[PDB]
């Protein structure tokens, strides 16, 4: 009356666990993971076993079932390389690394000031200032050239834009990074994140009983990077903590400001989540920005459509920047499209707390279930012509097809801060510049814990 199949009758990935661990040892990474999975899905179907009890799915069909099984305490897998550092230095873990009742406790005291629509209305104007400074700075340099255009690799400037906006919205501090040269503090922070991501892949696929002695140099490499990260994050904390102890302001001065004033969370559990918000707000946000710019340069037909929208609502957004979330549907659709093809978050994890059925297969509890978004977003059955950058496919309205930020109570905490940074930067670049490129070959994607472009194209910014 439904049909359920044995778990042991699942299509099995041909690989051998141990050899892939030795391949990662040798290659110092797993850059082509998204491709090896996409291929396997094409050979075995929309579900298969992979003892790297792990099950890999790809259909919105399955995400919905996975949220139905989400308990009151959804459970992702512990990320030991990250947790190890937290306890080596006697730190508390944030929402990204917690599970069970402690996670629910932190999460419910963070949602109001980090994710709610009322909080977005307060920090969104602050993001807008940074986005306007980004284009104002870019326009000054552009109109200095004879052809009123600047051609460059924008990945540095964009990454320093996301550090600016994130620090302003989190701590209410303004660091001279947009319109000015990078500081050694930021360049060291970005390099630590790069190494923290690299070394994570080298250690996350083998238990600590092996990586301890086969790759101890990497563990050192890994903890050093975190130290540099906790250094940058904690200097942001120590500044705002001392600044608030002497005056409790009456206006909005950032997110972490409210979290400290409320004091619903212990000091160590604010520092913990304040680390995860400072650290996970740079790469994950900046790379979809770059790909959005890239895809618009490849499709000027789509670009001008977005520029028209953004030029019309330009006035009502300068009056109240909050309107950007509702006056720029096409640009919000473009962002949905970028993440469909270039999902910085490759997969969603759930250790199911209860039996379930996927693709008419029995899934026991305690099983790890990974949703592989790279193939989910490329399944022609659900996305007609998935090879095409078509923002208008999201405007019609199809509910679990857009899950780059996860689902359930666990869904991304910074979801709306990221959307505002991406949206507001693209809105002010579209109404002042044209983004053009000769580079029209697809950009190869790399897996270093996140899915990111292995190359950054040359982009021209021509002014209007
Ligand atoms: C395009 C940008 C981003 C994408 C695609 C993304 C993706 C994701 C995904 C897939 C998850 C897992 C959720 C789940 O498994 O249910 C997640 C969780 C999380 N993200 Fe984001 N993220 C982005 C930006 C950010 C930003 C900017 C921040 C902080 C400022 C952030 C902080 C977090 C945290 C703390 C969690 C853990 C939430 C929890 O476990 O309850 N992310 N994100
Ligand atoms: N501490 C810390 C921390 C937490 C999260 C991220 C990124 C990686 C994947 C993801 C999804 N949302 C944000 N992130 C990070 F880089 C550092």
From Swiss-Prot:
Keyword tRNA processing: no
Cell location: Mitochondrion inner membrane
A Pfam family: p450
Effect of residue 78 to P: Increases 11-beta- and 18-hydroxylase activities toward 11-deoxycorticosterone; increases 11-beta-hydroxylase activity toward 11-deoxycortisol
Enzyme type, top EC level: oxidoreductase
Annotated pathway: Steroid biosynthesis
Record membrane topology: Peripheral membrane protein
Keyword vocabulary terms for this entry: Disease variant, Heme, Iron, Lipid metabolism, Membrane, Metal-binding, Mitochondrion, Mitochondrion inner membrane, Monooxygenase, Oxidoreductase, Steroid metabolism, Steroidogenesis, Transit peptide
Effect of residue 147 to W: In CMO-2 deficiency; reduces 18-hydroxylase and abolishes 18-oxidase activities; leaves 11 beta-hydroxylase activity intact
Gene Ontology MF terms in the entry: corticosterone 18-monooxygenase activity; heme binding; iron ion binding; steroid 11-beta-monooxygenase activity; steroid hydroxylase activity
EC number, UniProt record: 1.14.15.5, 1.14.15.4
Amino-acid positions noted as binding 21-hydroxyprogesterone in the UniProt annotation, renumbered to this chain: 347
Binding site for heme: 412
Function recorded in the entry: A cytochrome P450 monooxygenase that catalyzes the biosynthesis of aldosterone, the main mineralocorticoid in the human body responsible for salt and water homeostasis, thus involved in blood pressure regulation, arterial hypertension, and the development of heart failure.
Additional note from the record: Expressed in aldosterone-secreting tumors and in adrenal glands of patients with idiopathic hyperaldosteronism.
Similarity remark: Belongs to the cytochrome P450 family.
Name of this chain's protein: Cytochrome P450 11B2, mitochondrial
């Amino acid at each position: 009356p439904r049909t359920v199949l044995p778990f042991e009758a699942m299509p099995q990935h041909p690989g051998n666990r141990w050899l892939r661990l030795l391949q990662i040892w040798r290659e110092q990474g797993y850059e082509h993971l998204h491709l090896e999975m996409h291929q396997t899905f094409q050979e075995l179907g929309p579900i298969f076993r992979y003892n790297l009890r792990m099950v890999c799915v790809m259909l919105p069909e399955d995400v919905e079932k996975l949220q139905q099984v989400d308990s009151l305490h959804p459970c992702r897998m512990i990320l030991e390389p990250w947790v190890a550092y937290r306890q080596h230095r006697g730190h508390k873990c944030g929402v990204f690394l917690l599970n069970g009742p402690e996670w629910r406790f932190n999460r419910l005291r963070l949602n109001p000031d980090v994710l709610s629509p009322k909080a977005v209305q307060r920090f969104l104007p602050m993001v807008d200032a940074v986005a306007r400074d980004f284009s104002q700075a870019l326009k000054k340099k552009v109109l200095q050239n004879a052809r009123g255009s600047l051609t460059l690799d924008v990945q540095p400037s964009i990454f320093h834009y996301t550090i600016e906006a994130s620090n302003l919205a989190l701590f209410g501090e303004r660091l001279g990074l947009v319109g000015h040269s990078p500081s050694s503090a930021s360049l060291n922070f970005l390099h630590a994140l790069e190494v923290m991501f690299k070394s994570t892949v080298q250690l996350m696929f083998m238990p600590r009983s092996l990586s301890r002695w086969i790759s101890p140099k990497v563990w050192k490499e890994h903890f050093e990077a975190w130290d540099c990260i906790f250094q940058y994050g904690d200097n942001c904390i120590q500044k705002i903590y001392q600044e608030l102890a002497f005056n409790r302001p009456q206006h909005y001065t950032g997110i972490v400001a409210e979290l400290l004033l409320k004091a619903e969370l212990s000091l160590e559990a604010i520092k913990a989540n304040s680390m995860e918000l400072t650290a996970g707000s740079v790469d994950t946000t900046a790379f979809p920005l770059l790909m959005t710019l890239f895809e618009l340069a490849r499709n000027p037909d789509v670009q001008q459509i977005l520029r028209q929208e953004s030029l019309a609502a330009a006035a009502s957004i300068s009056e109240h920047p909050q309107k950007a979330t509702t006056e720029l549907p096409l640009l919000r659709a473009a962002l949905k499209e970028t993440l469909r093809l270039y999902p910085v978050g490759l997969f969603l994890e759930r250790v199911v707390s209860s039996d379930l059925v996927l693709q008419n297969y029995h899934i026991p509890a305690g099983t790890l279930v990974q949703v592989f978004l790279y193939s989910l977003g490329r399944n022609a059955a659900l996305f007609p012509r998935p090879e095409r950058y078509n923002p208008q496919r999201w405007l019609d309205i199809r509910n679990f097809h857009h899950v780059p930020f996860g689902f359930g109570m666990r869904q991304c905490l910074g979801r709306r801060l990221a959307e505002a940074e991406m949206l507001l930067l693209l809105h002010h670049v579209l109404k002042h510049f044209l983004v053009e490129t000769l580079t029209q070959e697809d950009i190869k994607m790399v897996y270093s814990f996140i899915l990111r472009p292995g190359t950054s194209p040359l982009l021209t910014f021509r002014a209007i």
